[PDB]
């Protein structure tokens, strides 16, 4: 359990990256 | 302990995006 809860930590901090990607987006303009 | 410091990185998560999305609706341009 503990590793499948890590892999979806790995997952989300997957998501944060796109969450940068948009900061980056917002940025451009 | 730990899933809820994803809890707290998920509320920085969902703060940037609503900040994002405050942020293009008042400089849409």
Redesign the interface.
């Given at each position: 359990e503990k590793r499948r809860?890590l892999l979806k930590?790995l997952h989300?901090h997957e998501?944060?990256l796109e969450?940068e990607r948009?900061?980056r987006a917002?940025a451009a303009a």
């Open positions: 809860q930590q989300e998501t944060e969450d948009k900061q917002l």
